[PDB]
Amino acid sequence: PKGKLATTVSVGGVKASVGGGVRVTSAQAGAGVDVADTIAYTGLVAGEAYSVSGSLFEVADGRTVGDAIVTKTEQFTASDSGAGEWTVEFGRVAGLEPGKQYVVFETATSVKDLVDTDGDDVPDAAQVEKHEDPNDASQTVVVEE
Ligand SMILES: [Ca+2]
């Protein structure tokens, strides 16, 4: 099993655009904003449960800065095809700062062992797929100054 995650962050129901992120006003940041993330997954094991942890990180100069602003973990089930979409809802996120940018990272970890890593034909490790791209605009929230 070898899969891929793609992510698209959403704020106030606005999806980050492929080349544009999603913008929030300084006042909205101060009030708190509802953040969600849609994970497009492929090559997961059909019908299997995955523990998905998402983090929102401050990003500057192409790196995450400090500990995540928020983290959320929940369980999802993979579609019958092993490909599909899951939506993580972070709730209202506070403390995003004017003029700063934030990025969503996601990691999916199968509840069951599904990967043979030593070659004895027995599954010994979870399938783990992750999307942790600090420069991915589709995962990026930008707060106006
Ligand atoms: Ca093995």
| H-run or E-run covering 58 | strand 49-60
What's the gap in Å between 114 CA and the centre of ligand 1? 9
Residue 87 belongs to what H/E stretch? strand 84-93
User: Which experimental method was this entry solved with?
Assistant: X-ray
CA of 51 to the centre of ligand 1 (A): 21
Residue 33 in contact with residue 92, Cβ under 8 Å? yes
How far is Cα 105 from Cα 136, in angstroms, rounded to an integer?
A: 10
Enter the resolution in angstroms.
1.5
CA angle 65, 71, 75 (to 5 degrees): 145
Distance CA 22, CA 75 (A): 26
Q: Would you state the structure tokens that stand for residue 43, as one six-digit string?
A: 């090559």
Q: CB within 5 A of ion ligand 1: which residues?
A: 116, 118, 120, 122, 124
Ligand 1 midpoint to CA 115 (Å):
7
CA atoms of 103 and 117, how far apart (whole Å): 31
CATH number at 4-143: 2.60.40.3930
Q: Report the C-alpha gap between 23 and 140 in whole angstroms.
A: 9
Token pair of 131 as six digits: 């999307």
